[PDB]
Amino acid sequence: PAMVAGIWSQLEATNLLRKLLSIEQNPPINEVVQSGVVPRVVKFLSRDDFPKLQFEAAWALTNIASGTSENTNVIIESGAVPIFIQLLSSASEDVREQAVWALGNVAGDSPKCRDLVLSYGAMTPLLSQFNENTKLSMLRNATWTLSNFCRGKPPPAFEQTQPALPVLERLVQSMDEEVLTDACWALSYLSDNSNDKIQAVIEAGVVPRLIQLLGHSSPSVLIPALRTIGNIVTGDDLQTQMVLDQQALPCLLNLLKNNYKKSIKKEACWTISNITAQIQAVIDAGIIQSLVWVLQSAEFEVKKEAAWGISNATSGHDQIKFMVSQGCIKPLCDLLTCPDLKVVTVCLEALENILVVGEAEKNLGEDNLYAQMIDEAEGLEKIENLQSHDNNDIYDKAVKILETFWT
């Protein structure tokens, strides 16, 4: 409005500058760059002797880091990021926490910013920061900044984030919901797309704790923990087995059985489908009833995942007979009229696998029971209608099912 930048005690000015930037609506950031006093403020970061000015300066730049990637990039070009790194070793507790904050804002903005922060080796001082003497405010701030250090896609070089795993393992032991949430998010990022990464996460010994978090009374914690476990099962079988051996399935059942948040149910189904690829384990837990219940009653985003869970099991003989005895056919049949072609093909794949086992056990004088059951559930009509379908791939899949099991 009518500011005088008397920064050239000027702390008084730096405080106003900082407070102006921390305005909620229309923060006047770009006009601070017009005046061009950012390098002067960057010099104040290097004033260990006068930590109030240092604190108000760091805060003022943390605020500029918030928002858009530019004007975020001007803080990078000013050379403030390296200064924030060595501020993590300052004697002032308020400066250290502020330095942690600033680096979180920056790293979180983009993978380019993240990698830049990691290239300067911000990890090492950020970890030498968690201990018994660490307060709640610092504990929360640091775990969150760490969350952003691992966040983003493309992901950061695994081996840069790898030493976080030892610390993360301890952070999940906490009972603070803000710390637990971000820790699980951090872990969920470190398990995405690479069996090598998934293995490292298991070796840290976080799996048993994450199971307990599946029974947590707060979706903030429940979701990222459930996501991490979902990522662990997407890897190979020996990795998937480690979650099974930790009795994760009773916890997953609860999420389907009890009426949790719509999005949590669908994450649980997604996780179950990545197991069915060790199918024996899921059957013993009694998941199929609730999974069939979901496949009929629950809304489409969850049905889609349930369908995947069923089909993948039928891909991986005696087991299928139990699934049919749970009344899974009718559920699968009525989804053949679905608008989504991906789930229609998934259901065809499922019924085909069932019909194969139907023919198999028939040859042991009777008919194919499952083909009869499909016909009994109005399923044969729906399959015959797929011959008039737009998608050629579905016509083809529909025809080959008829020619093999109905002539």
Numbering used by the authors: 78 to 85, 91 to 359, 364 to 402, 405 to 452, 456 to 498
Question: What text does the study give?
Answer:
The importin-α armadillo repeats form two NLS-binding sites on the concave side of the protein, referred to as ‘major’ and ‘minor’ binding site. Whereas bipartite NLSs make contact to both binding sites, monopartite NLSs bind to either the major or the minor site (Marfori et al., 2011; Chang et al., 2013).
A crystal structure of the MOS6 armadillo repeat domain suggests strong conservation of the NLS-binding sites between MOS6 and four other Arabidopsis importin-αs. We attempted to crystallize ΔIBBMOS6 in complex with either HaRxL106 or an HaRxL106 peptide containing the NLS, but we did not obtain protein crystals of sufficient quality for structure determination. We superposed the ΔIBBMOS6 structure onto the structure of rice importin-α1a in complex with a SV40NLS (Chang et al., 2012). This revealed that essentially all amino acids of rice importin-α1a, that make direct contact to the SV40NLS at the major and minor NLS-binding sites, are conserved in MOS6. Superposition of individual models with the ΔIBBMOS6 structure revealed an almost complete conservation of the major and minor NLS-binding sites in five out of six importin-αs expressed in rosette leaves (importin-α1, -α2, -α3, -α4 and -α6).
